[PDB]
């Protein structure tokens, strides 16, 4: 990695940040008032005898959440292209690691997965909190893998740990989509299936990019290819998800 | 570490395993038939419009779960004191790491925390699955910390990550104990408070032992002290929990 290659990333990051900011502003300006509940069912006696009717504790608005997980990326991409921050960024890229990315992801991906789970029909607060925790744990495992190992040496243990700890929310989503034991006759709409399938494919793409970067082939021996891939996939995922919720839920107003 | 110090651990582990086996047999022989439900509340229309009454999907018996998380430890403590397995065990202890312990813990602690959460009044299946995932992630973080770092060098990052990823279930337990937004007039019993407080103290004890082992003082520079502490605390925790559930829930028969 020479000076010019690290120099072009300034303009690359600036362009990404501008795109994110414009999309956030449009979504804030056009969305209507929609909300989804967080509930809770309490006991009314001994530990396993009698329950009570569910009650609503909180209500999430959707437009603000979408604007939130776009604004986070916009802010971070503008921070990286700053002054002394860029000096530390280049110094860390020279050492084959990046820290800003994981700090961004551990919040953005968690918000995404919470919203996706909430649309499918999950309302308990503890379920959402634990899903948040699981996703953050997966990202931290990726951070540890990047920090403690070296390319082409054949050690891939934290990668496998992160793969193990990132499949639980999708098992839960599958369970609520199959819906065992229910008594109902209303079928799931189509945009739910579209959202689920598309986001699963994007998550698989992120994992594959990590694996190919640390395998060390004859072409992927350069770190900047993986850096550019991580920027582009992040720019695509956010836009692919934010405009599927808007068209179908937030539009009739 | 000399030969005799590694030799005494054979008898130590055998004694621990025998104690676990006897307690498991007693609990199996004396318990009655008690069960707790796993439920689920599904939609009946568009994503955020109409719900349905909760239904029961599964039912956990309690005596079998208690026997399970005692039998796991019994089996592992008998495996370690075997033949060639003991050779590999001693070889790994010479290198300042142990693997059997984490393989045991990642299941035993998860079963414990699932049962503790279920007693407090949590019934959603996704909540229990994600709690399982979070606890396993914490144990794996401990494994990575032990594998990739060295005592007295001042690096404690995976320890902090494991501390971060192990506080979510207790936040959920606190939320269901405070019970915000409910309409009820029945107070929580006392053995619930006893169980919660005691198990929180024991988990803090485990974390403290890890930290003191890897700080490297003038007295804790020997690894076998930490090994013995991990055996004793595990032998106490299991017994402290299995006989508080039995006396109060499983006894009137």
């Amino acid at each position: 990695p020479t000076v010019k290659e690290i120099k072009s990333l300034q303009n690359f990051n600036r362009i990404a940040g501008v795109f994110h900011l414009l999309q956030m502003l449009a979504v804030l300006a056009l969305a209507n008032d929609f909300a989804l509940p967080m509930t809770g069912t309490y006991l009314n006696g001994p530990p396993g005898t009698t329950f009570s009717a569910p009650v609503v504790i909180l209500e999430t608005p959707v437009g603000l959440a979408v604007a939130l997980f776009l604004g986070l990326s916009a802010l971070f991409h503008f921070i990286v292209s700053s002054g002394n921050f860029f000096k530390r960024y280049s110094a860390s890229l020279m050492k084959n690691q990046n820290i800003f990315r994981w700090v961004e992801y551990s919040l953005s991906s968690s918000v995404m997965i919470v919203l996706i789970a909430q649309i499918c029909g999950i309302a308990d607060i503890v379920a959402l909190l634990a899903i948040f925790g699981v996703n953050a744990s997966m990202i931290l495992f990726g951070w540890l893998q990047e920090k403690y190992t070296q390319p082409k040496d054949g050690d891939l243990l934290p990668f496998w740990f992160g793969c193990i700890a990132g499949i639980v929310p999708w098992i839960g989503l599958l369970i609520y989509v199959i819906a065992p034991g229910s008594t109902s006759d209303v079928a799931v709409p189509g945009f739910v299936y579209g959202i689920i399938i598309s986001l699963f494919l994007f998550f698989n793409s992120f994992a594959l990019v990590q694996y190919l970067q640390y395998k060390g082939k004859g072409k992927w021996s350069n770190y900047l290819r993986g850096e550019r891939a991580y920027i582009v996939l992040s720019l695509v995922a956010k836009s692919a998800l934010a405009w599927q919720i808007f068209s179908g839920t937030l539009i009739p107003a | 570490p000399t030969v005799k110090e590694i030799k005494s651990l054979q008898n130590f582990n055998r004694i621990a395993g025998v104690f676990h086996l006897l307690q498991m047999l007693a609990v199996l022989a004396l318990a009655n038939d008690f069960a707790l439900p796993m439920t689920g509340t599904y939609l009946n229309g568009p994503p955020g419009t109409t719900f349905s009454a909760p239904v029961v999907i599964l039912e956990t018996p309690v005596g079998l779960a208690v026997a399970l998380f005692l039998g796991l430890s019994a089996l592992f403590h008998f495996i370690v004191s075997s033949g060639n397995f003991f050779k590999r065990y001693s070889a790994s202890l010479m290198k300042n790491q142990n693997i059997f312990r984490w393989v045991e813990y990642s299941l035993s602690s998860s079963v414990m925390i699932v049962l503790i959460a279920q007693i407090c009044g949590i019934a959603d299946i996704v909540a229990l699955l994600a709690i399982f995932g979070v606890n396993a992630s914490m144990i794996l973080f401990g494994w990575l910390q032990e594998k990739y770092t060295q005592p007295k060098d001042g690096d404690l990052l995976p320890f902090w990550f494991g501390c971060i990823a192990g506080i979510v279930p207790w936040i959920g337990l606190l939320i269901y104990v405070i019970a915000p937004g409910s309409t009820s007039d029945v107070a929580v019993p006392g053995f619930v408070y006893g169980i919660i407080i005691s198990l929180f103290l024991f988990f803090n004890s485990f974390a403290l032992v890890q930290y003191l082992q890897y700080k490297g003082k003038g007295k804790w520079s020997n690894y076998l002290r930490g090994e013995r502490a991990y055996i004793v605390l595990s032998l106490v925790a299991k017994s402290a929990l299995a006989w508080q559930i039995f006396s109060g829930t499983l006894i009137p028969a």
Partner: nanobody
Amino acid sequence: MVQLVESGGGLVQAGGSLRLSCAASGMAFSISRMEWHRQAPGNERELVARITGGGRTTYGDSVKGRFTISRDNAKSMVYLQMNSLKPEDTAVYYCNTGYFWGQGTQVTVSS
């Protein structure tokens, strides 16, 4: 408030059969566990059946092979079917949950 109201009972012969019914109130009926209790005029109390809200059923070891408890969701009903009675079941029956009792009913068996 939780209100449990049961009906049925009365006076029958030795070989008769009965069907007692219990109706519940503002709780989550599809999860909670319901019970049937019996008190004789002169004894303390007993246990008759449990339904555990999921399907499983346990009895009191003195009425096995004679009684049958069932539940009906979407109407909040608990049914107890008594067959092949004996001249000792003269008693008062109560519908029970997590200590929210109800006003029992009288069952009488003649010779």
